Amino acid sequence: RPNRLIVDEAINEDNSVVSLSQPKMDELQLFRGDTVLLKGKKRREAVCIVLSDDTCSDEKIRMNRVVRNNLRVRLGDVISIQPCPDVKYGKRIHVLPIDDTVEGITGNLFEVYLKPYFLEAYRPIRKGDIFLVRGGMRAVEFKVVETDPSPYCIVAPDTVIHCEGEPIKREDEEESLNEVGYDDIGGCRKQLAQIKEMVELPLRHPALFKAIGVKPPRGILLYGPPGTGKTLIARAVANETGAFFFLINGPEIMSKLAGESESNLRKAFEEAEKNAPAIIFIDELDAIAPKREKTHGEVERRIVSQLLTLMDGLKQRAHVIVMAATNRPNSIDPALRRFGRFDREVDIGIPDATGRLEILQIHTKNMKLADDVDLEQVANETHGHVGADLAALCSEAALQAIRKKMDLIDLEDETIDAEVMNSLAVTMDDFRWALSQSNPSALRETVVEVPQVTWEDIGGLEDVKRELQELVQYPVEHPDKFLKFGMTPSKGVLFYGPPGCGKTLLAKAIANECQANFISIKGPELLTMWFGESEANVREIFDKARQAAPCVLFFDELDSIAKARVINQILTEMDGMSTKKNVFIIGATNRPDIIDPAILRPGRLDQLIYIPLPDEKSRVAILKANLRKSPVAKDVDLEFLAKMTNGFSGADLTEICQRACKLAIRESIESEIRRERERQTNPSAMEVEEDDPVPEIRRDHFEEAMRFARRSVSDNDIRKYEMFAQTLQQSRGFGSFRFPS
Amino acid sequence: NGPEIMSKLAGESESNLRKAFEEAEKNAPAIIFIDELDAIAPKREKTHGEVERRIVSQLLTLMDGLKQRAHVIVMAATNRPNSIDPALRRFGRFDREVDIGIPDATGRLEILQIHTKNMKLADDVDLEQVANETHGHVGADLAALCSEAALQAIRKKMDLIDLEDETIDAEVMNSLAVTMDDFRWALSQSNPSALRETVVEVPQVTWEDIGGLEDVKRELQELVQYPVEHPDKFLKFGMTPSKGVLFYGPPGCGKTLLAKAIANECQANFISIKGPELLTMWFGESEANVREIFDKARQAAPCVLFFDELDSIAKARVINQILTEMDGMSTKKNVFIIGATNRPDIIDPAILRPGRLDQLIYIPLPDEKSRVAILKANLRKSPVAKDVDL
Amino acid sequence: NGPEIMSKLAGESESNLRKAFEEAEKNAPAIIFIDELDAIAPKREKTHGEVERRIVSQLLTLMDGLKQRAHVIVMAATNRPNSIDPALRRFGRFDREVDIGIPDATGRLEILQIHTKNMKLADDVDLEQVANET
């Protein structure tokens, strides 16, 4: 579609002028004296007269700076140009000096800055246009805020003046830059795409959506842990299109008196239908509508009923949707989770590591940075922070970088010199100081992301890998062929084996191969439910996984609650879970005989995969996996470590590499305690050649650390699990028969 | 409306209810409907303030102040009929009670036939296919399912319906029809169903799903078929019927698949509560929470409520409540209680006392002419080569 | 003061808090101090009436309605930081938290050096002796 063109630099000084190309004249049919609208970023536009020149390229417009800034476009971004035949003369655009280069002149300046500048051009000026006028070494920009014609105006010199107000400072610009775009959000990208598909496609097209018969959503809960900018995503979804925003703050409508708060909610809902198809956002919905237990007085119940009535009294013709944001979607009064009021529900949870990059890219935008700083390094580090925690992290790093310069920035420096204000950049160890020493993270809860441990982290075990492929890979990667002959899929296996053979490290591997989501609740997170008698508190971790349907929720030592229940609730939700969703439940254990036989009943956990001790071609993979970080000398052999440690568990040779690491750190601090202990310390023959005694683990560090190796599992327990494998059937019967001819 | 008369101020809501009742006698023999009655009349535990009790008393007075000459009836709709203030479940106020429960599979067809009325459909779409699929949705869930299928069909065409197409061309507005895999996408990948509770419908497993066992079949005919299909001949010589047997046998010999078969033959209704749904009552000490599943079955009187591994609550109670309602249940209703177990010796001997569970039918392992029927039953879906012998 | 704004009548205490916050922006970049915050904002269990919840919501709104251009910070002081309504421990309202705990022995010296400033002392008195003691 020949509408959008790239923008490059210009030479000319004339203003409200856009450059079109001369080889393409007959498609547009507009001559020189026609007014046009120019589409810019973040849904803000400007108007111009055209210039037809040859100095522009074929797809590139040469335009001046102030309308490049009113469209908010920079080098590479692509803008649109369109004709607008509604050009007309107007009365009293409201100019206002928004610059500090007025130099304290007041009164009528408009006889030398306005009237000779606008004429003999038919200058089109839109509301919010930021054109400047320079006169007498005074570059004052006149941003109009009140235009009686619509949308733009042509200034007449016969227009009477109205300029009694006072020129103001940069705050009116600061309440217009927070008409934010999609770029100001990270860490919730897939959910932003989902909520965009839920909201904007009704909002941008309200005609064919009602004409087809698809229902617009009437309520979207933005639930999730606090501080991740749940209101910022509502302002983003609003201001990216022609949507009106309205922010019903939570406790602000509870701060009012009795009876008047219902009038506040009625005014808030009436101002939605006053404006366009709009969007109202009610943050902290639990403060005005908690669960019915925490409703002591009657005024909260009256306000909750008023909100329910105002929600149900909506129209399909109103085209206004409502959003809210709590922490956990069981913490709302469940009367308003019914149909027609709040049906859809999206989880802007905690961001993952790759989503944690851009959320501090947007916070380190306006700061000077060093070279040693690596945002990927702090990305894979701090796995458990939220976006406001990262803002506090950046703020504390800035304070640490200021604090390390206060030895020469003294208090006697009253008028502060601007040398530090353009020559200070935060470096890497300041980030490490602000991250490790300070900022306790505000996060404990479950996490949902794909894992990253590949299949070559535990090599071998090809039978277990092939079985897990047939049980997890195929009902996701090939859903149609399962309905060819209609075999219903299974719903999860039960791993069992000795402690520390890579049970969890294998259960994450199929999630990493399928690119499926993965939660992980453990034993201690399990039995704290029934130590506190929260037996009916697994429904939320089940439908958390159902919210991210390609998932594998992984229990861990689920026989630990059989130390004598919550098995009965974990079973009734396993049966209540439908099978079309591909969520699988793989649990692991260490004593598979103490487990409840009802959970091994066919229908909920059928297969019993036995993870043995790691074999020869696997222990070379585990030693090649734990040695990813630490450098190893090339003469250090690991294949010789394979056929020397036969019956060692996987959790045991992860210790002997931590033992050889600990021994090499002992040799390094041993060297650094005698390097500075120089007697007859001559300043001559300086340390331009460093010692560097142990830049990697040597062979004798391994040969000394190997002498403290110890097998954790005995021979009596591997013999116990083999006896459990034969207590299990594994074709306990005939075998090797054939069919008659 | 329910919360709309609770959104008003104090005292004026009683005037709203008085205006609402007076406008009934203003017009013809009429019908007033009060949705979400629990919001204005919850159980007496959840009445903290006094204004709710005044409104509840006002509703009770306006209900009892009706006339037989007024010819106006009142309706209300809650979720569960124990969640109302039981003062207004008395006589003269709310006597009758009907259960518009979750629809079955054959009732699920027309409820999306009415939702796909104004849409263009393809040929690969089969409403019977989505009918026997999604057994646990409600009608608003199916409206959301149809809406999400329409959104999926729009979303698969946005590669050529671009944002630069400002004035939208009407070509898609008369040439787009949702097809089968869009319904499968909206059903399987999305729409978590808003339903867990019990279900009431006739089953569909016939008698040839477990062939043979003719002695057990003949006994179940004499114990279930005859007090329904021939109620008058039982009063000829006046033998009182029994009230249910106790199946017992090895795990997985088609106990439940047999207990559904007599329900399918009698065309009687069938609920099914299981072991884990049983012992979660007394893990939470909800021992007096079986009255509702008994009179749920009494609401659908030709029914066979089927327990399953009812010795699982004998892992050490709710047996005492399940017994006192079994004795309290009248015998003119033909509701039978057939329970199954795997360890019939650990069971409580009070439940085998003659009067509540008398017969003890022993389901053995399936014999020769039955295993051919089970392999001819599990192979209904998947195609099998003709040279494969069963 | 904490209980002083709870000693007022209903409705007028919110006007007291609004006056207190408005007098901050009346003056310079300032600092308001609310001692005994649990008396006006306890945990949600110990909120029987509705007036405490209205006052807590008023404080939350006045806290969130601040500006980066106002340059006024707020301080509070309770005994244990679980004894406050955890709605106001969120981000943007009360993020940082410092522990002025019990002083140690070497910190116990100067805290009675400032109390024995205006008294005549003998020679046998040893403040280090009462420092490592008590």
Which residues of B fall within a CB distance of 8 Å from A569? 280
DSSP code of A50?
Answer: E
Q: Are 3 or more Cβ–Cβ pairs between A and C shorter than 8 Å?
A: yes
Rounded Cα gap, residues A393 and A187, in angstroms: 16
Please give the single-letter amino acid code of residue C81.
P
A254/C contact by beta carbon, under 8 A: yes
DSSP character string of A387-435: HHHHHHHHHHHHHHHHHTTTTTS-TT--S--TTGGGT--B-HHHHHIII
Q: Report the CATH number of the A1-87 domain.
A: 2.40.40.20
Q: Which CATH architecture has domain A88-170?
A: Roll (3.10)
Neighbour order of strands in the sheet with A244-248: A244-248, A278-283, A321-325, A220-223, A344-347
CATH of A179-350, one of 3.40.50.300, 3.40.50.2300, 3.40.1390.10, 3.40.50.720: 3.40.50.300
Please give the single-letter amino acid code of residue A205.
H
C69/A contact by beta carbon, under 8 A: yes
* Region at A154 (left for phi over 0; alpha for psi -120 to 50; beta for the rest): beta
A539-546 vs A567-576: helix axis angle to the nearest 10?
30
Query: Residue C46 burial (CB < 10 Å; 0-12/13-18/19+)?
Result: exposed
Domain boundaries, chain A: 1-87, 88-170, 179-350, 351-445, 446-614, 615-713
Rounded Cα gap, residues A367 and A363, in angstroms: 8
Q: Which helix (H) or strand (E) holds A110?
A: helix A110-113
Contact C85, C41 (CB under 8 A): yes
DSSP code of A170?
Answer: T
For B183, phi then psi, to 5°, come to: -65, -40
Q: Which helix (H) or strand (E) holds A657?
A: helix A656-675
Contact A160, A90 (CB under 8 A): no
B200/A contact by beta carbon, under 8 A: no
Tell me which residue in C50, C54, C95 faces A255 most closely, judged by beta carbons: C54
Contact A472, A584 (CB under 8 A): yes
Q: Which helix (H) or strand (E) holds A222?
A: strand A220-223
Q: Is the dihedral of CA A386, A388, A392, A395 positive or negative?
A: positive
Query: Residue A686 burial (CB < 10 Å; 0-12/13-18/19+)?
Result: exposed
Rounded Cα gap, residues C14 and B284, in angstroms: 45
For chain B, where are the alpha helices, taking DSSP H only? 12-26, 37-40, 51-64, 107-113, 127-132, 139-155, 180-184, 214-220, 226-229, 255-266, 275-283, 291-298, 319-328, 368-378
Please give the single-letter amino acid code of residue A433.
W
The superfamily in CATH containing domain A446-614 is P-loop containing nucleotide triphosphate hydrolases (3.40.50.300)
Contact C58, C17 (CB under 8 A): yes
Partners of chain A (3+ Cβ pairs below 8 A): B, C
Q: Which helix (H) or strand (E) holds A189?
A: helix A189-204
Among A604, A585, A612, CA closest to A520? A585
Rounded Cα gap, residues A707 and A705, in angstroms: 5
Cα end-to-end span (Å), chain A: 69
Rounded Cα gap, residues B321 and B161, in angstroms: 63
Contact B308, B272 (CB under 8 A): yes
Task: Using DSSP bridges, classify how beta strands A139-141 and A132-134 pair: parallel, antiparallel or unpaired.
Answer: antiparallel
Residue B30 structure tokens: 């009429």
Q: Which residues pair with A142 in a beta bridge?
A: A97
Task: Using DSSP bridges, classify how beta strands A244-248 and A278-283 pair: parallel, antiparallel or unpaired.
Answer: parallel
B377/A contact by beta carbon, under 8 A: no
The method of structure determination was cryo-EM
Please give the single-letter amino acid code of residue B116.
T
CATH topology identical between A351-445 and A615-713: yes
d(CA A538, nearest CA chain C) in Å: 24
Residues in A 161-190 with any Cβ partner in C closer than 8 A: 171
Among A656, A670, A671, CA closest to A702? A656
The residues near A385 (Cβ < 8 Å, ≥ 6 apart) are A356, A393, A439, A441, A442, A443
For A646, phi then psi, to 5°, come to: -85, -65
Residue written as token pair 């409907």: B33
Rg (CA), chain A: 34
Q: Is A91 annotated as a binding residue?
A: no
Torsion over CA of A311, A312, A315 and A316, rounded to 10 degrees?
100
Contact A276, A244 (CB under 8 A): yes
Which residues of C fall within a CB distance of 8 Å from A178? none
Helix, coil or strand: residue A126:
strand
Helix, coil or strand: residue A270:
helix
Rounded Cα gap, residues C45 and A573, in angstroms: 32
The residues near B286 (Cβ < 8 Å, ≥ 6 apart) are B280
A300-338 b/e (C-beta count within 10 Å ≥ 16 → b): bbbbbbbbbbbbbebeeeebbbbbbbbbebeebbebbbb
Cα end-to-end span (Å), chain C: 31
Q: Which residues pair with A553 in a beta bridge?
A: A585
Rounded Cα gap, residues A402 and A400, in angstroms: 5
DSSP code of A83?
Answer: E
Q: Is the dihedral of CA B323, B329, B332, B333 positive or negative?
A: negative
Among A379, A421, A418, A385, CA closest to A402? A421
Beta carbon pairs, A and C, within 8 Å: 44
A309 to B277: CB separation less than 8 angstroms, yes or no: no
d(CA A566, nearest CA chain C) in Å: 28
Q: Which residues pair with B269 in a beta bridge?
A: B303
Among A222, A218, A276, CA closest to A245? A276
Among A431, A311, A417, CA closest to A373? A431
Among A56, A58, A18, A60, CA closest to A36? A18
Substitution target from C60, C85, C94 for chain A, most A beta carbons within 10 A: C60
- Helix, strand, coil abundance in chain B, percent, nearest 5: 40, 5, 55
Substitution target from A1, A80, A580, A606 for chain B, most B beta carbons within 10 A: A580
For A68, phi then psi, to 5°, come to: -70, -30
Contact C56, C90 (CB under 8 A): no
Distances (CA, A) of B138 to A51, A333, B151, B191, B192: 62, 21, 20, 11, 11
Cα end-to-end span (Å), chain B: 62
Rounded Cα gap, residues A144 and A150, in angstroms: 13
Residue A176 structure tokens: 């217009």
Q: Where are the beta strands (DSSP E) in A64-137?
A: 78-83, 124-126, 132-134
Contact A710, A645 (CB under 8 A): no
Rounded Cα gap, residues A233 and B51, in angstroms: 40
Residue A424 structure tokens: 């200070």
Residue C43 structure tokens: 């945990």
Give me the CATH topology for the region B198-366. Rossmann fold (3.40.50)
A294 to C44: CB separation less than 8 angstroms, yes or no: yes
Rounded Cα gap, residues A722 and A718, in angstroms: 6
Q: Is the dihedral of CA C5, C11, C15, C18 positive or negative?
A: positive
Compare all CA atoms of chain C with the CA of A225 and give the residue at the minimum distance. C90
A486 to B381: CB separation less than 8 angstroms, yes or no: yes
| Largest pairwise CA distance in chain A | 112
Partners of chain C (3+ Cβ pairs below 8 A): A
Compare all CA atoms of chain A with the CA of C59 and give the residue at the minimum distance. A255
Residue A535 structure tokens: 């037996």
Give me the CATH topology for the region B103-197. Helicase, Ruva Protein; domain 3 (1.10.8)
Residue B21 structure tokens: 């009742």
Rounded Cα gap, residues A639 and A622, in angstroms: 11
Helix, coil or strand: residue A569:
helix
* Region at A42 (left for phi over 0; alpha for psi -120 to 50; beta for the rest): left
Helix, coil or strand: residue B75:
strand
DSSP character string of C95-112: ----------TTHHHHHH
Tell me which residue in A284, A300, A392 faces C95 most closely, judged by beta carbons: A392
Q: Which residues pair with B201 in a beta bridge?
A: B270
Q: Is the dihedral of CA B53, B58, B61, B67 positive or negative?
A: negative
A568 to B280: CB separation less than 8 angstroms, yes or no: yes
Q: Which residues pair with A6 in a beta bridge?
A: A60, A78
Among A80, A15, A5, CA closest to A41? A80
How many CA within 13 A on the CB side of residue A678? Answer: 10
Question: Omega into A217 within 30° of 0, i.e. cis?
Answer: no
Rounded Cα gap, residues A398 and A433, in angstroms: 11
Q: Which residues pair with C8 in a beta bridge?
A: none
For A215-346, where are the alpha helices, taking DSSP H only? 230-239, 260-274, 285-288, 299-312
Substitution target from A568, A575, A599 for chain B, most B beta carbons within 10 A: A568
CATH of A351-445, one of 1.20.1440.130, 3.40.50.10490, 3.50.50.60, 1.10.8.60: 1.10.8.60
Rounded Cα gap, residues B252 and B250, in angstroms: 6
Q: How many helices (H) and strands (E) does chain A have?
A: 25, 17
Rounded Cα gap, residues C57 and A496, in angstroms: 53
Rounded Cα gap, residues A662 and A656, in angstroms: 9
CATH class in words for A615-713 = mainly alpha
Q: Which helix (H) or strand (E) holds A116?
A: helix A115-118
Contact B105, B131 (CB under 8 A): yes
The residues near A130 (Cβ < 8 Å, ≥ 6 apart) are A66, A69, A70, A141, A143
Rounded Cα gap, residues B243 and B359, in angstroms: 10
Distances (CA, A) of A533 to A488, A566, B283: 35, 9, 10
Helix, coil or strand: residue A697:
strand
Contact A4, A71 (CB under 8 A): no
For chain C, where are the alpha helices, taking DSSP H only? 12-26, 37-40, 51-64, 107-113, 127-132
DSSP code of A276?
Answer: S
Q: Which helix (H) or strand (E) holds A626?
A: helix A616-626
Among A302, A224, A233, CA closest to A262? A302
Contact A156, A76 (CB under 8 A): no
Rounded Cα gap, residues B151 and B143, in angstroms: 12
Rounded Cα gap, residues B166 and C66, in angstroms: 42
Rg (CA), chain C: 20
Q: Is B266 annotated as a binding residue?
A: no
How many CA within 13 A on the CB side of residue C56? Answer: 24
Among B271, B273, B332, B326, CA closest to B99? B271
